[PDB]
Write an enzyme that holds these catalytic residues in place. Structure first.
Site, short mmCIF file in Angstrom:
data_model
loop_
_atom_site.label_atom_id
_atom_site.label_comp_id
_atom_site.label_asym_id
_atom_site.label_seq_id
_atom_site.Cartn_x
_atom_site.Cartn_y
_atom_site.Cartn_z
N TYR A 146 0.79 -1.24 0.00
CA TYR A 146 0.00 0.00 0.00
C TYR A 146 0.82 1.28 0.00
O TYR A 146 0.23 2.32 -0.32
CB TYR A 146 -0.93 0.06 1.22
CG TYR A 146 -2.10 -0.85 1.10
CD1 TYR A 146 -2.09 -2.15 1.56
CD2 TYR A 146 -3.28 -0.39 0.53
CE1 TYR A 146 -3.19 -2.99 1.44
CE2 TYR A 146 -4.40 -1.17 0.42
CZ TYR A 146 -4.34 -2.51 0.88
OH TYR A 146 -5.51 -3.23 0.77
N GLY A 192 2.72 3.99 -1.43
CA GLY A 192 2.97 4.42 -2.77
C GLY A 192 1.67 4.54 -3.53
O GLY A 192 0.61 4.15 -3.04
N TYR A 203 -7.70 9.18 1.76
CA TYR A 203 -7.67 9.96 0.53
C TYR A 203 -8.87 9.63 -0.38
O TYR A 203 -9.41 10.53 -1.00
CB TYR A 203 -6.36 9.78 -0.25
CG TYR A 203 -5.22 10.67 0.16
CD1 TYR A 203 -5.19 11.36 1.37
CD2 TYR A 203 -4.17 10.86 -0.72
CE1 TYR A 203 -4.15 12.19 1.71
CE2 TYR A 203 -3.10 11.67 -0.39
CZ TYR A 203 -3.09 12.34 0.83
OH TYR A 203 -1.99 13.12 1.10
N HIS A 210 -4.29 5.44 5.14
CA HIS A 210 -4.11 6.72 4.44
C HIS A 210 -4.78 6.71 3.06
O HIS A 210 -5.44 7.64 2.68
CB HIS A 210 -2.63 7.04 4.40
CG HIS A 210 -2.31 8.39 3.84
ND1 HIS A 210 -1.76 8.52 2.59
CD2 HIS A 210 -2.44 9.62 4.40
CE1 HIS A 210 -1.58 9.81 2.40
NE2 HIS A 210 -1.99 10.52 3.48
N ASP A 211 -4.59 5.59 2.34
CA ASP A 211 -5.25 5.45 1.04
C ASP A 211 -6.75 5.57 1.18
O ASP A 211 -7.42 6.23 0.38
CB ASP A 211 -4.90 4.11 0.40
CG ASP A 211 -3.49 3.93 -0.10
OD1 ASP A 211 -2.63 4.82 0.08
OD2 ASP A 211 -3.22 2.85 -0.69
N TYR A 243 -3.08 22.89 2.47
CA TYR A 243 -3.75 23.25 3.70
C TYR A 243 -2.75 23.90 4.65
O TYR A 243 -1.58 23.93 4.37
CB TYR A 243 -4.46 21.99 4.30
CG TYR A 243 -3.51 20.84 4.50
CD1 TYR A 243 -2.51 20.85 5.43
CD2 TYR A 243 -3.58 19.67 3.72
CE1 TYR A 243 -1.64 19.82 5.64
CE2 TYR A 243 -2.70 18.62 3.88
CZ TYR A 243 -1.74 18.70 4.85
OH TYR A 243 -0.82 17.70 5.04
N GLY A 300 -1.47 3.86 -5.38
CA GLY A 300 -2.23 2.65 -5.50
C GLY A 300 -2.08 1.73 -4.27
O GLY A 300 -1.66 2.16 -3.20
N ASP A 340 -3.39 13.13 6.54
CA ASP A 340 -1.92 13.19 6.54
C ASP A 340 -1.37 13.16 7.95
O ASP A 340 -0.37 12.47 8.21
CB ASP A 340 -1.48 14.46 5.81
CG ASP A 340 -1.63 14.44 4.31
OD1 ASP A 340 -1.97 13.35 3.77
OD2 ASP A 340 -1.39 15.49 3.68
#
Ligand code: CA
Ligand code: CA
Ligand code: CL
Length: 123
Positions: free
Chosen positions: A28, A30, A52, A48-49, A73, A32, A99
């Protein structure tokens, strides 16, 4: 935006090179990712993916224009602690927390170099 995420990761992990160390790791970390995370760091990237993905569907984020990679931000770093600013709009605040959560997660888990450059067969 990414160079703010980089900043956050450096905030928590000053010895890191974030766009090197946390890219092309596991299933995970990177662009994709799918399948089974190989360790807790990879699970941070899974999380995190997913964050997003949620940011991209938020009503308050305009498609493409407000994407998490390029949407700057406001945040600060104080004694290796991150704060997401109350000055942010709703989209920005969401992304900032994606993040922040990931930078904190990365700082709390081991780094296993053997998981760099895994082939997708492993996922
Ligand atoms: Ca990913
Ligand atoms: Ca912005
Ligand atoms: Cl923090």
């Amino acid at each position: 935006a990414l160079w703010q995420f980089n900043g956050m990761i450096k905030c928590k992990i000053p010895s890191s090179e974030p766009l090197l160390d946390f890219n092309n790791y596991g299933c995970y970390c990177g662009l994709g990712g799918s399948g089974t995370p190989v360790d807790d760091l990879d699970r941070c990237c899974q999380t995190h993916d997913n964050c997003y993905m949620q940011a991209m569907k938020l009503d308050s984020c305009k498609v493409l224009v407000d994407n998490p990679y390029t949407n700057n931000y406001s945040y600060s770093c104080s004694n290796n602690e991150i704060t997401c600013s109350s000055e942010n709009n709703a989209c920005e605040a969401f992304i900032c927390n994606c993040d922040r959560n990931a930078a904190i997660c990365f700082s709390k888990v081991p780094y296993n170099k053997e998981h760099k450059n895994l082939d997708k067969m492993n996922c």
